[PDB]
């Protein structure tokens, strides 16, 4: 029988979710089984739990973003180039593997979302215009992004049912730490400037393969090994809850003790 | 050289145009139903679709989708009363801000639900969704009783002389025609009564709906039936959009054409 409101709000109260707390979700829809209400009622008992002082954020990106357009063709980059939509964050869709609850929470009453294409995030409480503010273009997952701010506002994430891999916080792990081998990449993409679809070159780190031999899966796993963050069932999901302070500075030490400044 | 398929994506520029090749012009009034898959893959995904289909429209004109209420509990009667109890206390009510639009209406109506400036109908089972100058017409004071009847957002659209457009959907989910069972003097129509949670004053209040069933026919037809005959008698215009069939249909003409249709095999002649 599907799972309600009121007991998925016990559910997250019992695994540490509290009042007033800055949240990331991670989720897979199918792994919490039936909802009374479907996925909204995940959401609205996640934002009650954390109540209107709280603030619960995901990652959305972009769907349809043509990051990929100039390994293509002249012809066809062309065509890209004059006729695909800019990035418009009032309509740009979340990334389908992002978890369909990421696109419910992009289109949540009184959501902000961040002005970063490829590393857009979706936030829905007290802090969430704080968090997703002034989301720079380049390093979208460094010093001006979300997750620095998440970190430094000592905020958590919550794993429910996601696999471990997917933290996406990590990836500001990677930017952070003090590595022998980084990759850095440089793509287009359309925005808007001036109510204007203007083409621009981002640069990041590489975020589709890691910069040396290691996994987030890895990382992840041995911090919970070590005692990090705490777990527990939510619907039929295992949810894992991290203080993202914490994670990402074990996760920054966990990258430099292997690869990082032998000097 | 043997020629190549290069296998570009549908654009913005040639949707616009297969929609206006149609006969969509500025300033109409138009319902959707589609298949993204039947569209094929478009430069930019559904949000194009919608967005080509806005600009052959103007902001003049007006888009409408049925959205619905994907997650409507109105089925909790044929529940044990012990897990029926758990609904009437846990299910949420039907929130126009959040409620997901029926899956089976396709992920574009979820989109348009979505779209900035979009309104709304209060209805929930039959909730429409529009965006343009006259979705606020359209959508407004949408009965909770007889959803498809005389206080819907289709009897609006039969009013100000508006447009069906099937982008590769199967005829058979013209929703509007609905509304012409609902005024077709047919020997028989099924009533349906069931519950649903709405809100009233900021809660949940449960209430009892009435409606003709749109579950099934009243009788021995099919709207796929209705609309073949319509478009073998002249009906309406057809092109290609991407890769779906495309058919488009005047409200009004289809809606009395189905009217006499239903009538014509299925009143009733008896004197009461
Ligand atoms: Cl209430
Ligand atoms: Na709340
Ligand atoms: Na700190
Ligand atoms: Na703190």
Same mark, same amino acid.
């Given at each position: 029988?599907?799972?309600?409101?009121?007991?998925?709000?016990?559910?997250?109260?019992?695994?540490?979710?509290?009042?007033?707390?800055?949240?990331?979700?991670?989720?897979?829809?199918? /792994?919490?089984?039936?909802?009374?209400?479907?996925?909204?009622?995940?959401?609205?008992?996640?934002?009650?739990?954390?109540?209107?002082?709280?603030?619960?954020?995901?990652?959305?990106?972009?769907?349809?973003? #043509?990051?990929?357009? =100039? *390994?293509?063709?002249?012809?066809?980059?062309?065509?890209?180039?004059?006729?695909?939509?800019?990035?418009?964050?009032?309509?740009?869709?979340?990334?389908?593997?992002?978890? &369909?609850?990421?696109?419910?929470?992009?289109?949540? #009453?009184?959501?902000?979302?961040?002005?970063?294409?490829?590393? *857009?995030?979706?936030? &829905?409480?007290?802090? /969430?215009?704080?968090?997703?503010?002034?989301?720079?273009?380049?390093? $979208?997952? $460094? &010093?001006?992004? #979300?997750?620095?701010?998440?970190?430094?506002?000592?905020?958590?994430?919550?794993?429910? $049912?996601?696999?471990?891999?997917?933290?996406?916080?990590?990836?500001?792990?990677?930017?952070?730490?003090?590595?022998?081998?980084?990759?850095?990449?440089?793509?287009?993409?359309?925005?808007?400037?001036?109510?204007?679809?203007?083409?621009?070159?981002?640069?990041?780190?590489?975020?589709? =393969?890691?910069?040396? =031999?290691?996994?987030?899966?890895?990382?992840?796993?041995?911090?919970?090994?070590?005692?990090? $963050?705490?777990?527990?069932?939510?619907?039929?999901?295992?949810?894992?809850?991290? /203080?993202?302070?914490?994670?990402?500075?074990? /996760?920054?030490?966990?990258?430099?003790?292997?690869?990082?400044?032998?000097?």
């Amino acid at each position: 029988i599907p799972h309600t409101h009121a007991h998925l709000v016990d559910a997250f109260q019992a695994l540490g979710i509290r009042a007033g707390q800055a949240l990331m979700l991670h989720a897979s829809v199918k /792994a919490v089984g039936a909802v009374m209400g479907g996925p909204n009622v995940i959401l609205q008992a996640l934002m009650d739990a954390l109540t209107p002082d709280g603030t619960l954020m995901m990652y959305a990106g972009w769907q349809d973003i #043509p990051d990929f357009i =100039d *390994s293509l063709p002249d012809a066809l980059k062309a065509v890209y180039l004059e006729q695909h939509p800019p990035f418009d964050p009032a309509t740009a869709r979340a990334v389908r593997e992002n978890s &369909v609850l990421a696109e419910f929470l992009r289109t949540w #009453p009184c959501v902000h979302r961040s002005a970063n294409p490829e590393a *857009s995030m979706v936030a &829905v409480g007290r802090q /969430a215009a704080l968090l997703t503010a002034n989301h720079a273009l380049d390093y $979208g997952y $460094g &010093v001006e992004s #979300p997750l620095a701010k998440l970190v430094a506002i000592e905020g958590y994430v919550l794993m429910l $049912g996601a696999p471990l891999d997917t933290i996406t916080l990590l990836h500001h792990a990677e930017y952070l730490a003090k590595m022998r081998h980084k990759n850095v990449v440089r793509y287009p993409c359309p925005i808007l400037r001036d109510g204007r679809k203007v083409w621009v070159t981002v640069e990041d780190y590489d975020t589709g =393969d890691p910069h040396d =031999d290691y996994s987030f899966e890895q990382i992840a796993r041995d911090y919970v090994a070590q005692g990090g $963050g705490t777990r527990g069932k939510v619907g039929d999901a295992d949810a894992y809850l991290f /203080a993202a302070q914490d994670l990402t500075r074990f /996760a920054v030490q966990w990258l430099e003790s292997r690869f990082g400044d032998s000097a």
